[PDB]
Design a protein around this nucleic acid. Sequence first.
RNA 1: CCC
Length: 482
Amino acid sequence: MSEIRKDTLKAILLELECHFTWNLLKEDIDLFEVEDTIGQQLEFLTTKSRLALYNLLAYVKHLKGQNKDALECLEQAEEIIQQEHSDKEEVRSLVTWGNYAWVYYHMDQLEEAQKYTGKIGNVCKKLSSPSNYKLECPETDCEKGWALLKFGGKYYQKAKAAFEKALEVEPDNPEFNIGYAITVYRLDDSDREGSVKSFSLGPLRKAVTLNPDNSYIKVFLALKLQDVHAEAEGEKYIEEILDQISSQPYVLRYAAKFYRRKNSWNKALELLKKALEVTPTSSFLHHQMGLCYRAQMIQIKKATHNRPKGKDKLKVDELISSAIFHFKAAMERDSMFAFAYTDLANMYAEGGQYSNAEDIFRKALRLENITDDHKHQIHYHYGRFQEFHRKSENTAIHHYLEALKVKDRSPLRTKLTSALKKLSTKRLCHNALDVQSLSALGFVYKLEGEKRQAAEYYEKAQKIDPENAEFLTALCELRLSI
RNA sequence: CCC
Ligand SMILES: [Mg+2]
């Protein structure tokens, strides 16, 4: 192909609606985890669109440099279109064809790619689309919403908008409602400024009504009810679900979360183990197992006033070892699972395995592509490890400051500001010229809206370090604020 | 998927 036809083709490729134009970046996920879990949903979450799953898996295989394997996934998608979408064959094929075009493009099979853009263009014309090479429709909006969700927390607002676009056309579509309600449910937990939210409660009730046979959507309703102090109602739903299904890991794992949150740890462990028989490598399941063992360990520690002896001490050590095992497995199976790192590191710290804790915290601090909320929490946990285990007040202060710089409204805000005030005040009693502590107080007072007091701290810090760029900038901000 |  002449490289002028090439430029034209590249332009068309960008106009398509498919995974390659949805800004799904590989660095935001663990590709092995995503590939593996897509396979596990194909087998074990049988209510989710198989067509969507294969289109997504094809994209993921491409991201792993396996273009030949991506093609095979798209072939399976085509088979499903014959199987499950025969009446609307052409329109249901658009996303698959888009991915074919992009994959063949990447394999330098330009003529083959053009064949696919041609098919797309023909169908869009046939169906009176206002665009040349796309036909926006609710089913595609839904598929896009799920693809966005799979790429993680940075994409949740975009996924919500995609499901909203689908619901604009079909407000009572059962599939669209599930996607939307689950997105709002995750957003209730995402980027919290304070208490957990419950905007998803209404959407979940509707999605459950619209999908009576679906235990997967119902388990989120139960969890949300638990969040809003209707634990009794939530638990009845859990019981009904467990009467209706067995061994479905995507349902059992959330029932296990439910039971754990009311401290029924043995029941949670029973459910998690049943799920592990089906999917023994799931990082989600492993994390949940560790959470159970950790909770049981904490109960013994509290009961024995943090001084367990004899068999209590033996059990505590077994539980710590088991929590480490499972948190380590979770992290190893999902490199982007922020909480797996901090939970593992914190458990290493609890067991006094400080070199191990440091190793994990170091990796966690270097995760560049997780959400700012997760970065914030990593700094908080490392700060606490520094303060209480390493007894390094200056390193603690440093990381508490980093936590607030990344996110200054969170449920950790007041824990962070109070720790900083406490540590900085103590250090200033010993050395009135301690620049880090002066600077820290300036930062916290500025955050609290105490402009004058903040200025005074920064001015003392600047007196000591007159050319400091950070202090000059802080003082300028304080002067120009209205 | 922590809290
Ligand atoms: Mg996952």
